[PDB]
Amino acid sequence: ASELLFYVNGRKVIEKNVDPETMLLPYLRKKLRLTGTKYGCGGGGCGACTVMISRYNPITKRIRHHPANACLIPICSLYGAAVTTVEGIGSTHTRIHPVQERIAKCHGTQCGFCTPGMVMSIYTLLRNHPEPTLDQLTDALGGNLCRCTGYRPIIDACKTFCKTPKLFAEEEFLPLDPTQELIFPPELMIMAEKQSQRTRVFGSERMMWFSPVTLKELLEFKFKYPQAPVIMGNTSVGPEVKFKGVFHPVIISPDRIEELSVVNHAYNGLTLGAGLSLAQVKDILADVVQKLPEEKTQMYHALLKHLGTLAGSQIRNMASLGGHIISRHPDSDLNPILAVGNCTLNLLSKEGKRQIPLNEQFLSKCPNADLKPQEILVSVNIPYSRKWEFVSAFRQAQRQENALAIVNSGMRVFFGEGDGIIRELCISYGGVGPATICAKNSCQKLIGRHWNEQMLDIACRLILNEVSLLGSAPGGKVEFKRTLIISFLFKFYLEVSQILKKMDPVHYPSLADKYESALEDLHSHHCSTLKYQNIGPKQHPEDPIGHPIMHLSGVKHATGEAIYCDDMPLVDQELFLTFVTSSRAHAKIVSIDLSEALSMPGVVDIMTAEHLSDVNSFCKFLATDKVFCVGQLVCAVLADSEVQAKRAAKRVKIVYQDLEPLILTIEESIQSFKPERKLEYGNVDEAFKVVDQILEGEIHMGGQEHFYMETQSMLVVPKGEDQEMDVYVSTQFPKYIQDIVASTLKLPANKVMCHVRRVGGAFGGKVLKTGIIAAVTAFAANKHGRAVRCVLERGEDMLITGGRHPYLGKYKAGFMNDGRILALDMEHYSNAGASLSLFVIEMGLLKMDNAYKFPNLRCRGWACRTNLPSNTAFRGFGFPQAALITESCITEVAAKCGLSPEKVRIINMYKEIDQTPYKQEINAKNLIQCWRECMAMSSYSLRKVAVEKFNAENYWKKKGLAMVPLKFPVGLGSRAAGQAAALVHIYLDGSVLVTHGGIEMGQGVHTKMIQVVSRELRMPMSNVHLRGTSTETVPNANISGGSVVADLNGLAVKDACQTLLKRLEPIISKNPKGTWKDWAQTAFDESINLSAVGYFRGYESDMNWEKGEGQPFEYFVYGAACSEVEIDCLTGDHKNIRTDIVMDVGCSINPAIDIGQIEGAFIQGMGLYTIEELNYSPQGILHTRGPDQYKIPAICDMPTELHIALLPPSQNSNTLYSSKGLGESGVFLGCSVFFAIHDAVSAARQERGLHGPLTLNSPLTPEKIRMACEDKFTKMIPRDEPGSYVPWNV
Amino acid sequence: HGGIEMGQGVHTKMIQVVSRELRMPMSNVHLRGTSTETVPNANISGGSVVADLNGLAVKDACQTLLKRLEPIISKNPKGTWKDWAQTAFDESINLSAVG
Amino acid sequence: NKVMCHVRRVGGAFGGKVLKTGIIAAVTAFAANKHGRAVRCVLERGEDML
Amino acid sequence: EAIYCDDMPLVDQELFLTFVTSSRAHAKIVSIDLSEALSMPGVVDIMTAE
C-alpha cells in the first residue's frame, strides 16, 4: 500500500507499488538513467558503486552524510533519504566539482571505470571534513579498487585538499567552496520534523517488506514473522541471497529507532546500540580512548584496531553492530574480541526484557544460549577493563586492509592483586572453524600459572590440541592457520610481558633486545617524486607532443558522463542473455533438462549446442556431449530481463558423469604430440664440462585474473534489413568480433559492423571469449529479431574468462665462482587450461634472456593442456613469467657463489653492443645506464647495510632489498600484424574528425592521436575530435595489443595528415596567415578533397623457429627497479617501504600517460608476484569466497615511497617521434618486490641456521612467507599424512 | 558515398558500378546508407546528377584498389576475391580507399 | 566534428527536403541538447503542406 | 522491412516536438500565452524565438 519517497541528486523520486527486491545500483542505472555509478563486483568489495546517503536527524537537528555501496542497498530502506551520485555533484553541462576536476587533471583516471566511485568516496569525506588530513582521505579510499593507475595519481589529488617540473598545475585548480555545496532537500527535513509512527509496507508476488518506525512496532513484527531477517545494512544477508541461493519471503527493516541508537556512558563501561554502524562505533570508541585512562579503555583499543582494517569505509558505514554480532561470521574480527571481554547482550521481546552473555555457545548458535525467534538485540554492554587486565586483538589476511581474515584472535588476561599469578584467561579465535571458538579448556588449565616462557611451550601445545583443524578443512591454509594460532599467542605473551614491565619494573624482566620488533605492526604516508624531460626552446609552445596532456575522456570519467558499453540506453524491446556454465572439470553431459526453466516468467529461449548446429565453432562455443573445465559455456538463457534470465538459469537441471583423468597441474599434463619451440645459442653441452659448479632448480608461478573493472559487456542490435548487425562490445579486437559474428550468422563481413568507443580495462582478457559470447549473443538476436545485451557478473566473468598462464620453469645452470653463467639449459611449461598459448611460449623464449648474455643457452618450451579455464594472453605476454624464472636461476647461483644477486646480475649483463640468443644485434647502452642511475637515485649501497643492520638487530621482523633490470623487446610476428590505418575528414568550418583501428582501454591512445593530429596539421587539439573505433570507418584493423597501438596507429594518423597537407600546399602558400576554416573552404571551392585514408604498412619483423634466429623486434624498452620490504616473520605480513624505477622510454609523446603506464604495469606485476592468488579445489572448482577471495592491489599495498625517472631522450628514427611503446614493460619490475621479500626471508633463514634449498614460488603469499621463516612454532604444529585427507586446495 | 536514396535507385547503380569495376557479383557488395561520419563535405542530392557524379567517385575508389592489387591479381588470375584480399593483408597492402 | 547526420533512405523528396528540413532539425536539436534527451519530429500532412 | 526515419525504434525516454504555426499572412504578434499549454500533461517545454 505505501509509497517509497526518497531523493536522488536533489530530485524527488516516488515509486508506487514498489518491488522490495529492487536494489539501488540497478534502479539508478536502469530506472533513473544515471549510469555513472558502475557495477564492478556486486559484493561491496571494489567501491565502483559508491554513493552518498544523507539523512536529517529530527532530534539532534543535523544532516548526517555517509558513504555506501549501492549494489547492496535495497531501495525500500531509502525512505526519506537523499542519495547523491557522481552526476549529482557536477557535470560538463552544469559546472565541474573540484574533486572531479582534480582527480582528472592529476591523471588519476586511465580506463576511468573506477573514477565515479573514487569521486564519491572523496566527495563524501570532504562533506564531513572540509579541512581534512591525508589519512582521512586514504582511509575513505580503503574500499576503492583500481587496476590501471597504481593509486599515486589519486593520492596526489587528495593531497591538494589537505592543508599542511610537475605533471599538473595545482595552483590552477579552483578552490573548494563548502558554503556552495549541494543543499539537503528541504522536503525530507520537513518529513523528518514530523515523527510519523505509521509502519510502512511494500510488497510483490515474491516478497513482503515491513519497515516499522517504532520499537513497539518492531517487536510486534518480530513476533508475527519470527524467521524474517531484521535488515539493517544488508552486508551479510545481501551477499548470501546474491550468490548462496538463499531467499527470504518476509523482510523486517526498521527505521532509526532511538533505543537501537543508544550511546550510554555507564559507570562500569558503556552500552552501544545494535543499530549503530561500525563506522559510528569507531568514532565513539576513538573518542573515549582519548579522554579516559588507558587502564579502563583496554577492550576499546582492541575493537578500534580491528575496526581500522574491517572492510573499507563504505561497508563500515552500512554494517551495524547488532548485525555483525547476530550474523556470526566465522571470520568476524570483532566477535572474538567481544567473546573474551565479558560482554552481555540486551535482548527485548513483546513479552519483556532479557539479558544474556556473549559467549562461545552464543557464537556457535546453541538454542539455549541464542536469542529466541521472537526477540531482537537492542544493545551490547562492553565493560571497562580493571587494573592488571589486558586485551589484545590479532589478525592476518591476504593484505592489510579490505580483506577477510585467514585467522584472527581476541585474548584477555587478569592478574589482579598485582602479582604474576594469572587469575582469568579467555582466548578466542576466528577463521578456524564454522564459528568463532574459545579455548575454554586450555585457559582453565592455565589458571594459577605465572607469565613466563615455560607457560608458552605448554600453552601452545594444549591450544594446538583444543583448536584442531582437519587437513581437509574449509579455507585451506591448514599448516599456516595452525601456526598463526600459536604465533598470535606468542605475540600476546610479549604485549602482556611489557605492560607488566612498564607498570611494575622491579618484579618483571625487560624484553630481549632483538625480540621487541614483534610488537609494532606495519603501518603506512605515501611519498613520491616523478622525474622527466621537458622539451623545450626549439619546439613551438603549442605543439602538444612531449607535454603531459590530460586524457581526453578524463573529466568525463570523473563526472560519469563517459558512456561505457552497458551505459548505453535500453534499446526498445531488448532481451538479456546469460549463460549456464559447467560445474565439473572433466565429465560427460548425460542430460540437460530445460523444462522448468523454459516455463518460467519472461523466458524467451534457451540454447544448447544442438540449437546452434553447424555454427557452434570457429577457426566450439557451447559444450556438446562432454565438459573439459569448470566455467565452460553450456546453455544460453534469453529472457525479457536480467533477473528473469538469472532466475531461469538456476533451474536448468544438468546431470554429469565425471571422467578420468582429471588433469589440473602441469606435472599431471605431462602424462600424444606437442610442437616444440627451441632456442640454441653456442654449445651448452661443451660448456657444462668447463664450469666450476652445476645447479638444478625449479619454480612454479601462478596465473592472474585480468580484473578489468568493467566486466565482459556487449549490446548486439539487428537493423532489420539485409540481416545487418551492429555489435557494440567492450573488446580489443573489433575485426575478430566482426568475423566470428558474421561467420556464425553465415553473412558477408559487410553486413556485420563492430563499434567500440571505450573499454573499461582489458589487459588481454577481452578478445577470444568476448567474441565467443558475441557470436552466441548475435545468434539469439538474429533468431528472435531483437536487440540482445550480455553483461557478466564478476563471479561468472572470472570463471568463463581465462587468466594469465601459470608457468613452471626448470633450469640446469653451469657457472663460474665469480657468478658468470656460461651454460644454461632452460625449460618452460605453461598451463594452457582446456584449449590452446603457444604464442605465449614463443614470446617467453624470445624475451627469456632479459638483461643477461647467456653465451651457451638451450631454451625449450611446451604448452600444457589441463582441465581448468582456458587461459589467455595478458599484459606482459610471456615475459613476466619468462623473466622471473631467469631471476630465480640468478638468485640460486648467487647463493652458491656467496655473492649478492645484484653482483651476479651486473656480471652477466649485456655489454653496450651485443647479440641475443636469436642472433639480433642490440644496443644495450640504456640497459647499463638505467641500472647505474637506479643504483644512484635509490642509494642502494647505503640502504643495503641499513637492512643488514636491521636484520642483525631484529629477530621477528626482517627487511629485504633487491634490484632487477629490464629489457622488454617490442615487436609482433610479421609486418602484416603491425599494419594500421586511419580516416581523417576536414569539414568546411576547419574542424577535424579522425578515427583509426586502435581501441581506448585506458592507455590514452586517442589522446595521443589528437596530439599527433595537432602537430601535423598545426592546429589546436580542441579543433580535432574522435568519436570511437568502427569496422564501418576503418576496415581490417589488427588487435589492440602488443604495446604498439598508439605507436602504429599514430604513424597511420600521421600519414593521413601529410596526405592532406600535400593537397593543401597550394592553398597554404597563397594564404599563409589564413585559418583552417579559410583553407578548408577555399579547398572545397577549388575541388580539392578534404577526406583521406591513412596507412602504415608495419614494422619489418620475422622469426625462423626451425633455425631459432631472426629480427622479430623493432626496438627495446630498457629499465631497472629497486624495491625494499619489511616482513613479519610471525604472521607472514609484509610492507612495501620504497620502490625506485628508472626507464628508457625514448621521447615520451605524453609523460603523464607514459608514467601512468609504468605505475599501473608495476602494481599489476607486484600483485602477480605477491598477493594475487587463485585457489582451485582437487575437483577443479575455483574457490571464490571467504579467505579464498581474490585480491588485486589496494592503496595499503602501494609502496610507501615511490620514485620514477625517465631516461633522457635517445633518438630512434624508426618510430613515431622517437617514442617507445610501453604498457606491458613495467609488469616484470614488480618482481623486485618478490626478490626483496625473498631477501628478507633469507636473512631470517641465515640467522636461524637454515641453509640449502630455498625455492619460494610465486605468488609469494603470506602463507608462503611465514612458513619459510621456520622457528619453534613451525616445527611445533600438528601435521597430517600427505594422502590421508582430501585438501581444500591444490 | 555522399548521395542519398530518395527512390531514384542511386544506391542500386553504385553497386552496379562496383560490380563492373572490381569484377564481382552485386551480392558481394553492400551499402548501409549515407553519413557525414564516413564521407565528409558531400554536395546536395539534386540536379539530376547524383548517380552520375557519385558513380565517378565510386569508380575512382575501385580503380585505386585495383592498382594496389595488380601485383596480387597477376600472380593468381584464377583466384577469388577472398584470396586476393587475404594475400593483400598478408603483404601489407591497404584494402580501404577514398574515391 | 561533433554533429553527424545519417540517412539510409528518404520516402520521396523532389526538392522539398532541404532548407525547411534543416530549420526543423536545428530547432529539434536545440531542444534535444537543452533537455539531454532524444527528440523526434514527424509532421502530419496538413502541417507539412503549410 | 525497409526502415524509414520514423520506423526507427523508440529511443529510451525520447520526447516529441511539434510546432505552433502562424495563422495570419502578415500580422504583428502582439502576445503569446503559454500558461495553459505549459501546465498540461506531459509537457516538458515550449520554445519561442526568445
Ligand SMILES: Cc1cc2nc3c(=O)[nH]c(=O)nc-3n(C[C@H](O)[C@H](O)[C@H](O)COP(=O)(O)OP(=O)(O)OC[C@H]3O[C@@H](n4cnc5c(N)ncnc54)[C@H](O)[C@@H]3O)c2cc1C
Ligand atoms: C565487502 C565486505 C567486506 C567485509 N569485510 C569484513 C572484515 O574485514 N571483517 C569482518 O569482521 N567482517 C567483514 N564483513 C562482514 C560485515 O562486517 C557484516 O556483514 C556486517 O557487520 C553485518 O551487519 P548488517 O547490518 O549488514 O547485518 P544484516 O545483513 O542487516 O543482518 C544480518 C543478520 O543479523 C540479523 N540482525 C541484524 N540486526 C539485528 C537486531 N537488531 N536484532 C536481531 N537480529 C538482527 C538479521 O536478521 C540477519 O540474519 C564484510 C562484508 C562485506 C560485504
Ligand SMILES: CSc1ccc2c(c1)N(CC[C@@H]1CCCCN1C)c1ccccc1S2
Ligand atoms: C607543430 S607546431 C604547431 C602545433 C600546433 C599549433 C601550431 C603550431 N600553431 C600554428 C598556428 C597555425 C599556423 C597554420 C594554420 C593554423 N594556425 C593557427 C598554433 C599557433 C597558435 C595557436 C595554436 C596553434 S596550433
Ligand SMILES: CSc1ccc2c(c1)N(CC[C@@H]1CCCCN1C)c1ccccc1S2
Ligand atoms: C566487367 S566484367 C564482369 C563483371 C562482373 C563479374 C565478372 C566480370 N566476373 C569475372 C569473374 C571474376 C574474375 C576476377 C575475380 C573474380 N572472379 C569471380 C564474374 C564471373 C562469374 C560470376 C560473376 C562475375 S562478377
Ligand SMILES: Nc1nc2c(c(=O)[nH]1)N[C@H]1C(S)=C(S)[C@@H](COP(=O)(O)O)O[C@H]1N2
Ligand atoms: N589503463 C590500461 N592500460 C593498459 C591496458 C588496459 O587495458 N588499460 N592494456 C595494456 C596492454 S596488455 C597493452 S598490449 C597496451 C596496448 O596499448 P599501447 O600499445 O598503446 O600501450 O596497453 C596496456 N596498458
Ligand SMILES: Nc1nc2c(c(=O)[nH]1)N[C@H]1C(S)=C(S)[C@@H](COP(=O)(O)O)O[C@H]1N2
Ligand atoms: N522516386 C524518386 N525519384 C526522383 C526523386 C525522388 O525524390 N524520388 N527526386 C528527383 C530529383 S528533384 C532529382 S534532382 C533527382 C536526383 O537524383 P539523380 O540525380 O540520381 O536522378 O532524382 C529525381 N527523381
Ligand SMILES: c1ccc2cnncc2c1
Ligand atoms: C589471439 C589472442 C590473443 C593475442 C595476443 N597477442 N597477439 C595476438 C593474439 C591473437
Ligand code: MOS
Ligand atoms: O598485447 Mo596486451 O593485450 S597482452
Ligand code: MOS
Ligand atoms: O535538384 Mo532536385 O531536388 S529539384
Ligand code: FES
Ligand atoms: S562495490 Fe558494489 S560494485 Fe564493487
Ligand code: FES
Ligand atoms: S582507471 Fe581506475 S580502474 Fe581503470
